[PDB]
Amino acid sequence: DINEQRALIKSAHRYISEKLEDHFSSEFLPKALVICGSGLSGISTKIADEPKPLILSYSTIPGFKVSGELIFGYMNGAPVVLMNGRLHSYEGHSLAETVHPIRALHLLGSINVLIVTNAAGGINASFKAGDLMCVYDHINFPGLCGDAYDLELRKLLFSKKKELNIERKIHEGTYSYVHGPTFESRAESRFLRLAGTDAVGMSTVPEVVTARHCGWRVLALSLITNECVVDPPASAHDENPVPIQEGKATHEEVLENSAKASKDVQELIFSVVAEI
Amino acid sequence: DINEQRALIKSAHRYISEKLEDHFSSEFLPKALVICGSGLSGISTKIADEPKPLILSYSTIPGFKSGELIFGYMNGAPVVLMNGRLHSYEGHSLAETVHPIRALHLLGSINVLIVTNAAGGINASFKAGDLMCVYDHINFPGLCGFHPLRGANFDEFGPRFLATSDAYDLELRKLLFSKKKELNIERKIHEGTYSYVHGPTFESRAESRFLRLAGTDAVGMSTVPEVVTARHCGWRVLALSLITNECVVDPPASAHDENPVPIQEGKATHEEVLENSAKASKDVQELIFSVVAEI
Amino acid sequence: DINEQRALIKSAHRYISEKLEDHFSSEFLPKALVICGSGLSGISTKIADEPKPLILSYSTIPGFKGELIFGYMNGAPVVLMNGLAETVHPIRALHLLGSINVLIVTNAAGGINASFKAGDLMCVYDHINFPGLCGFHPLRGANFDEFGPRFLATSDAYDLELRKLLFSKKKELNIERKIHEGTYSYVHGESRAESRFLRLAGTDAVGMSTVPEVVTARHCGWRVLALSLITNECVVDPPASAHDEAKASKDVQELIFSVVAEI
Numbered sequence: 001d002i003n004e005q006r007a008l009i010k011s012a013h014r015y016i017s018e019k020l021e022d023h024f025s026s027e028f029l030p031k032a033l034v035i036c037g038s039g040l041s042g043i044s045t046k047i048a049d050e051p052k053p054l055i056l057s058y059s060t061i062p063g064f065k066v067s068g069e070l071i072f073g074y075m076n077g078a079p080v081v082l083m084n085g086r087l088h089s090y091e092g093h094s095l096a097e098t099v100h101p102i103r104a105l106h107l108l109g110s111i112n113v114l115i116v117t118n119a120a121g122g123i124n125a126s127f128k129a130g131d132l133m134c135v136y137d138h139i140n141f142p143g144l145c146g147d148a149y150d151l152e153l154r155k156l157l158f159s160k161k162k163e164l165n166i167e168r169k170i171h172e173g174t175y176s177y178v179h180g181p182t183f184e185s186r187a188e189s190r191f192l193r194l195a196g197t198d199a200v201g202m203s204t205v206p207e208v209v210t211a212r213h214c215g216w217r218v219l220a221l222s223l224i225t226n227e228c229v230v231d232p233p234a235s236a237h238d239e240n241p242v243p244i245q246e247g248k249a250t251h252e253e254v255l256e257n258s259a260k261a262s263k264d265v266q267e268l269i270f271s272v273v274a275e276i
Numbered sequence: 277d278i279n280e281q282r283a284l285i286k287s288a289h290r291y292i293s294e295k296l297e298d299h300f301s302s303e304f305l306p307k308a309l310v311i312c313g314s315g316l317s318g319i320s321t322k323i324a325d326e327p328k329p330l331i332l333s334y335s336t337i338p339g340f341k342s343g344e345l346i347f348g349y350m351n352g353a354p355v356v357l358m359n360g361r362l363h364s365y366e367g368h369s370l371a372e373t374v375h376p377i378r379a380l381h382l383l384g385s386i387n388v389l390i391v392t393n394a395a396g397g398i399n400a401s402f403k404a405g406d407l408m409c410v411y412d413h414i415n416f417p418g419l420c421g422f423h424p425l426r427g428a429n430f431d432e433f434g435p436r437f438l439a440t441s442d443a444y445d446l447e448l449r450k451l452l453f454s455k456k457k458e459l460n461i462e463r464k465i466h467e468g469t470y471s472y473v474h475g476p477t478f479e480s481r482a483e484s485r486f487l488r489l490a491g492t493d494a495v496g497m498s499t500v501p502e503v504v505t506a507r508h509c510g511w512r513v514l515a516l517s518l519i520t521n522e523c524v525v526d527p528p529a530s531a532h533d534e535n536p537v538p539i540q541e542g543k544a545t546h547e548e549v550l551e552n553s554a555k556a557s558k559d560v561q562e563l564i565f566s567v568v569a570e571i
Numbered sequence: 572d573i574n575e576q577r578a579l580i581k582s583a584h585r586y587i588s589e590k591l592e593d594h595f596s597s598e599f600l601p602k603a604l605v606i607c608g609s610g611l612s613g614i615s616t617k618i619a620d621e622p623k624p625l626i627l628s629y630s631t632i633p634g635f636k637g638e639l640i641f642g643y644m645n646g647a648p649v650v651l652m653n654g655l656a657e658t659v660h661p662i663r664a665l666h667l668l669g670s671i672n673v674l675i676v677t678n679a680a681g682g683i684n685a686s687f688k689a690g691d692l693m694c695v696y697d698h699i700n701f702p703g704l705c706g707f708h709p710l711r712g713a714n715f716d717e718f719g720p721r722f723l724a725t726s727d728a729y730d731l732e733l734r735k736l737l738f739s740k741k742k743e744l745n746i747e748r749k750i751h752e753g754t755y756s757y758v759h760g761e762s763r764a765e766s767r768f769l770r771l772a773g774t775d776a777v778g779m780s781t782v783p784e785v786v787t788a789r790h791c792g793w794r795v796l797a798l799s800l801i802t803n804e805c806v807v808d809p810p811a812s813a814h815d816e817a818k819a820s821k822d823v824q825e826l827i828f829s830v831v832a833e834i
């Protein structure tokens with residue numbers, strides 16, 4: 001509640017460390033935490049089968065909530081943690097419950113980089129569904145009412161795009177974190193554009209802030225899954241109106257476009273973790 | 277927490293359903309819920325006298341909370357009147373504010389929400405006494421965590437992720453202007469963006485200026501949480517704002533101005549809001565009375 | 572809940588009023604409450620030694636969470652509080668004395684206007700209550716009707732005459748430190764894009780204080796004079812692209828010292 005949180009963090013670390021003590025023949029000290037958001041659902045298959053990876057369900061780790069698992073293993077030669085299943089503020093969870101896995105994993109003392117992906121709506125007018133955005137700055141709107149993105153890791157991400165011959169666009173710009181769970185209205189998207197937003201999403205920024213608070217480097221990659229509707233709605237005086245449902249955002253579209261970009265995103269992250 | 281507003285919603289649904297069952301000879305399936313905000317306090321007198329309308333006090337409905345539900349026929353159509361609404365600046369949560377919408381949704385007949393409210397004019401072309409038909413909104417508190425859908429999703433009502441670019445039905449807005457011409461109403465009816473702020477303070481000049489550049493046409497203290505909840509239930513929405521005052525947006529008098537305009541000039545007041553809402557009430561009454569017959 | 576909040580306000584005033592009676596020979600009716608922000612707490616040295624000032628720790632005042640200083644400075648009786656319903660409970664408690672008419676609040680603020688430098692002063696003549704627009708508001712809940720209105724205007728929050736007074740006192744005191752007139756944006760919890768957004772919204776200085784106290788004082792009918800100390804210029808320019816190769820406290824002290832004598 002006030003200090004039970006710290007005991008909960010210590011308790012979860014005791015569990016994870018003791019499980020890493022039984023599973024791995026040698027000391028497993030992960031250097032990267034990969035929050036497998038959109039586009040990273042299948043990167044767990046890129047974990048090496050040997051040494052056999054350790055899979056911890058959230059139900060057994062103290063403090064970890066559900067409504068999820070931790071994967072400890074080697075990817076591209078480097079030891080990493082993948083957390084499949086993330087908590088969101090719009091689901092009712094508190095900010096502490098959302099970033100509790102990061103604070104527990106930080107007690108291992110070996111992780112020094114957070115790599116996180118998420119879906120995002122395109123606010124920048126030149127953005128198209130299917131593009132990626134490397135985040136170099138953010139606006140925390142919920143934090144407003146109650147850099148941080150490592151330059152070398154961003155340089156590294158673009159070098160791996162060239163090395164892998166990935167044709168997919170990867171922009172640079174600002175990511176606005178909003179609470180959700182509603183998609184933005186037309187006037188809200190226009191406001192976000194005026195505020196300097198390039199893409200908008202409802203996750204990631206709280207984990208980034210906690211990761212920076214723990215001294216970790218951060219690399220954040222947004223998947224532009226849709227282009228936010230910005231045009232004013234059809235006037236009642238228009239005899240030939242554009243239907244107000246045309247181009248509406250949809251979770252099915254977010255899911256489909258996340259999966260379409262997953263092969264490129266997983267290849268980029270797999271190449272990056274070898275040089276963390 | 278999801279399991280106990282579900283229990284509260286279903287409990288409130290039966291209490292309304294059972295007393296709709298005893299009161300009306302023919303079963304009462306209302307087409308619309310009319311939130312009687314500013315300009316609609318008197319529309320209860322437009323309810324047809326037969327069949328006998330049913331009035332349910334909030335104090336006797338589980339989960340609810342001045343305040344009553346009026347079940348009757350208006351211009352031939354069965355409706356529910358929300359006479360008295362909960363505001364968030366009074367300390368109530370958003371879940372308590374929109375709980376009547378979810379409970380009334382279980383009647384399975386309502387597919388349109390008609391809601392009015394008072395609003396300060398941010399658009400410079402707006403005058404006190406004008407009306408604004410809402411076709412878009414800015415939910416700035418929702419962007420920052422003050423959202424009526426926060427928490428576990430009511431999967432039986434709507435999707436976890438809800439679009440709002442289609443929030444304000446076009447056919448209902450055209451029907452509203454069609455009734456303005458039919459009734460020969462000369463009052464101005466604009467079409468613009470409504471911004472929901474928490475209150476209970478009136479906006480400072482810098483807050484009104486910020487809302488203006490953000491794209492606001494009129495700023496109010498209610499409605500948007502109910503519109504979002506109704507849209508989550510799949511309802512069509514017709515929102516109508518009453519421009520009760522013109523927001524002070526010019527920067528305040530500077531200390532080095534030797535011909536300063538008094539900073540207290542044109543300040544907003546609750547009495548001006550009340551009196552302008554009353555003056556426009558007859559027009560708003562007539563408009564909603566005609567619209568309900570064609571929803 | 573308001574019933575218990577009302578009793579705690581009365582208890583705090585009943586304690587404060589009783590202590591003023593025992594301490595001061597002549598009855599003490601303070602005319603201004605001066606809130607001393609961080610780094611600007613040394614203003615307590617500007618209170619006259621005679622009559623003897625009264626210092627009440629917050630821990631001794633019922634309902635409070637720092638110290639309250641009751642004394643005379645420049646001949647005027649004032650209250651100094653050295654250091655959301657909790658934050659403004661002291662304002663409503665002190666209002667029950669029936670004498671305070673002015674709130675003078677000072678704070679440290681980050682510079683959003685590009686023309687500001689660290690060390691500059693800014694006289695607040697407008698604010699943006701971001702938390703209040705979203706739900707974190709000092710007046711949320713049942714209204715204190717005995718204190719003020721359910722709906723309060725904020726377009727007349729920063730008294731013009733009190734601002735004209737401050738500027739007059741700077742010329743008199745030959746203070747050369749620049750004093751700007753601008754908007755203070757209140758944020759509860761910045762990035763370059765966040766600082767850029769504030770500038771686009773009309774922010775001249777940003778911080779996490781002042782505004783809730785200003786609203787509560789305005790709800791009580793007080794006049795408000797707000798002064799900000801620019802401690803740093805918030806960076807606004809975007810970060811590098813992956814493709815490229817303390818003396819002001821005495822100045823504030825002199826200003827408040829000269830202002831309180833002619834409020």
Ligand code: HPA
Nearest residue numbers: 119120121200201202249
């Ligand atoms: O349009 C959007 N809005 C908010 N969050 C999102 N996440 C993916 N797309 C979107």
Ligand code: HPA
Nearest residue numbers: 394395396495496497549
């Ligand atoms: O100026 C206003 N601001 C906010 N809400 C309002 N409701 C009526 N007028 C106003």
